[PDB]
Amino acid sequence: WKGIAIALLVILVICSLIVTSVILLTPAEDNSLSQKKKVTVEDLFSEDFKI
Amino acid sequence: YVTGFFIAVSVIANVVETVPCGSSPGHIKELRYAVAFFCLDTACVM
């Protein structure tokens, strides 16, 4: 009565691996912070922007 | 027994989806709030 439980364990772990795969697959997130300071008032008169 | 385990994991997801470490912000500025529970939820619901 234990081997049937082993088959149940293997089918449930197959299902769980499917769940983990879809968890890593469907939400293909990407933050891409690109944290650079916004242009301030003095920037137009900063020497860097002095064309 | 397998549908019992599915019910159990569904209920565990239901209870854990509110703790401020897996489905609520425990980090105000860091990067988790995975909506994967939804997927898991769907994985159960179907």
Q: DSSP letters along B1-45, please?
A: -HHHHHHHHHHHHHHHTTSTTTTS-S-SS-----THHHHHHHHHH
Per the structure block, which two tokens stand in for A3? 């081997």
Give DSSP secondary structure letters for A6-45.
Answer: HHHHHHHHHHHHHHHHHHHHS----------PPP-SGGGG
> How many angstroms is the resolution?
4.2
Handedness of CA B8, B10, B13, B14 (dihedral sign): negative
B36 interfaces chain A, CB cutoff of 8 Å:
yes
Residues 6+ apart with CB under 8 A from A46: none
From chain A, pick out residues whose CB is under 8 angstroms from the CB of B40.
Answer: 19, 23
What residue in B sits closest to A23 (Cα-Cα)?
A: B36
| CA B40 – CA A21 distance, rounded (Å) | 11
